[PDB]
């Protein structure tokens, strides 16, 4: 023996080729690696199998499978104590040939699926994770959706189903039981609905014997190998039927969600895989999310839902490699923002809900009777995230807080204000101060623009929450430990250098990352660097182009729709200007509107003139010269003051 | 402002209040009552203007 | 009035190349070491040894507002007969002295040094005012010899609303109608805050950006990025790589087997070698960071159309200004015939109008987006063919508007009457 | 000059008024020039000053673009 880019639904970064069962082989590059070898050893008996191991390895200068033909005695643990003495004995035999995986196939004559045992690594400690499943079957099971967890599998009576005790790698408070099952098609319409009942009851009976114990949440994944003609609209109607019967039992086991993966030939014919997530949020399911597995044109398989739900659910257009977030994961980010004296970006929707809650509580006092249109604590605001689509075109998503693909986030909020109690909409855009200093990259610019563009097109006001570090700075890190220097004198390098060149071997490595000219010096093929391009984006002019675009956009927007900015934290460079182009601005007392850094001015002057960023950017300057329209005590007081506008 | 728009002469005759230029209170109350009657006459004028627009596009 | 068209929406008072021909190479080139009078690059420099002309016609430049914010030079000039508006940056450190207020006897004249190639509240205001002047009524093409390294970030300049007047440049640029050419000249710089307020994505329908082959432009100066992206430790990792003495000394510390008095030797040998290599190793990173801010990189990231040679700038702009002025008018006339009543980073002047795709096929020249000279000559020859295609489109659009005149049932009532 | 937004029997609208009292804006000392001290300036009431006129002009633009409020 591998495509690892246009292959079966997987995720690949830069240049890498990994295995199906072994998700982490070698990422470095597969330009220099020995070809994988496939070996299959059919042995009559478990004891006689040892002779087809020590002699089997002799024709090996990789993957080795071992088939057993004794359907008579199917041991468990006793089979493990019968295969471990052969692996500990030949611990150096299997090691020398450099084979990664050692699988075992054990079939029964009554129609029972074969049992698999896989040994992997240096000592081959036997990963309990891959059991009763094939390397092929390791893909459907995925297990790449549980990278943020420390997995320890537990015994299952049915070889098809596998249960794992997942614990949060960082914080230990997270303890969940994740189920992973594979249904293989029966050889030779009401088949699948009854098949679902049999496999889910088997999972329910297995979760019962291990016990509910202490689990915050519980999930189960069921992947289908058969491509039976699925009409999801008929599947959804039938889904409602059996979930209300199993639901009570699943509610006792502390199961919160279930994910099914079905292939539909009714679109031979193209098989469109349709995933479905059913979550038991607020005691009653009311979450039937019917998705569609399609490529994002970026090389990722994403979650496009055409659900039976009101489309205000969760998770939309996200890659198939999601790691199922662990609780308290949001907290470390919140800390990075809170040390700077600003609320974490995703905590703001809550601040706004309370400010609207506050706007009613006073209006009911001032104006008695006319109060009954109040929409309670919740339902005050109806927010939905904004993330750039496939074709650079924005869409309404209701996914989990955080997990922002860019250093900029937007929302479409329908706040039921006392002025418009039936609803009023607006856009809110903010920089994630934790995501690369909150600096403006091209991704961040294209987003900010498309948001301004939409608020304009709809006539609704736009609110910008500034907490940034101007444009993104950068140099090419890949060319730092590769570039060579050509001196006037090689013995004394301090005697000046002629230029900077790149070795021919290191020149072919990039070529498109650096513009090089060839000039023979000292009889060497020296490719002198005449200009640096760099592979990574957001280093120079690419940022300035985008910054200029959003600068003009804000200038245009102010003249059409209501534009407002809020200095929740230090607003530098381009960010500082968007506050002025946004015209109407609220400055939080301890946040500066700076252009050039306080120490950067001291270094330029050659003397310690300014000591603070607020000594030239603070409220005592901007509110006193009319850049700031109002000064707010805290981040919330800012929100409150804009709610009043 | 009593002559801020040339349509205020047409709107004056559609309303029918003598103290149209003045009696601000009486004017407001009339629009609220005859909101459907305005939308009725606006439409009568909308069809009227479309017929003339076709004559301009040939001339 | 000699620069201004006789009427409102009338073409400019252009004449033949006549005194200063279009087919001449720009002789005056500015020095890279010291400061230069930027005015010499526009009209020409009077020297002891002959006369070296600028990129515009000899003595055709007329400077205005020259007594206020001299940190930026504003005026009108002719390019081979074509009149146009000019904005340039003064490189020399000018000094404006504010008079003493007689109303307050405790007021004295304040000596202030407006350092060259920087934007100040008054300089930004001057820029913003000039732009409005050249578009409203005047309606002149604009040439900007961009050389600012940013904005004055000083407390006094900040308190003096530098941010407010900076925005007024951006506001004035979206308001513009006629073609605008942003050209970074040789030695010219465009760092941080400066670039943002002049980028072509502000008004892509009328802006066009070019840069000199030996011009520089980045987010920050190569001397400013080095203490953030190429710190002391990053330089020493590269020192223990290129220098043979430093990496050999590094192999001594790594091997161990040497006492407390022995390990002190290697430390006192390296922390003397690295102290002498540091100034030249610093300058290496400076050259390295400058290669990012080079002209080639700009064209590669598509922030500019083409890299330009200062020598043949006059020759290029004469046909590109002429090509754009005739084209802009034809495109404005296409829309006036079609409807008798831009959206991305990809918005480049070659995709400034959706009618340029239709006009492209009507012309029939392969190098249409380029070959500015060949394009101009074609329009002059096929003057009747364009007027012919305009009237074709005018009658085609009248047929669409009459068909659209629910609306059928209403017309059936207006006809029965 | 006093700028703001207020309600007239429920109807919200933009407001511009003139301060009658003699206000005093004190410009801070420039640290870049050690020969710079804070300047005490008395903006006498009911008069227009460069900053006051600018404030007026800015407020008007604010109340029309986007906001669209009666003045």
Residue numbers in the entry:
A (entry chain B): 1133, 1153 to 1212, 1253 to 1379, 1386 to 1464, 1469 to 1846
B (entry chain B): 2203 to 2261
C (entry chain A): 1847 to 2187, 2196 to 2259, 2300 to 2311
D (entry chain B): 1918 to 1988
Paper text:
Eukaryotic ACCs, instead, are multienzymes, which integrate all functional components into a single polypeptide chain of ∼2,300 amino acids2. In addition to the canonical ACC components, eukaryotic ACCs contain two non-catalytic regions, the large central domain (CD) and the BC–CT interaction domain (BT). Here we provide the structure of Saccharomyces cerevisiae (Sce) ACC CD, intermediate- and low-resolution structures of human (Hsa) ACC CD and larger fragments of fungal ACC from Chaetomium thermophilum (Cth).
To improve crystallizability, we generated ΔBCCP variants of full-length ACC, which, based on SAXS analysis, preserve properties of intact ACC. However, MS analysis of CthCD-CT and CthΔBCCP constructs revealed between 60 and 70% phosphorylation of Ser1170 (corresponding to SceACC Ser1157). The CDN domain positioning relative to CDL/CDC1 is highly variable with three main orientations observed in the structures of SceCD and the larger CthACC fragments: CDN tilts, resulting in a displacement of its N terminus by 23 Å (observed in both protomers of CthCD-CT and one protomer of CthΔBCCP, denoted as CthCD-CT1/2 and CthΔBCCP1, respectively). In addition, CDN can rotate around hinges in the connection between CDN/CDL by 70° (observed in the second protomer of CthΔBCCP, denoted as CthΔBCCP2) and 160° (observed in SceCD) leading to displacement of the anchor site for the BCCP linker by up to 33 and 40 Å, respectively. Comparison of flACC with our CthΔBCCP structure reveals the CDC2/CT hinge as a major contributor to conformational flexibility.
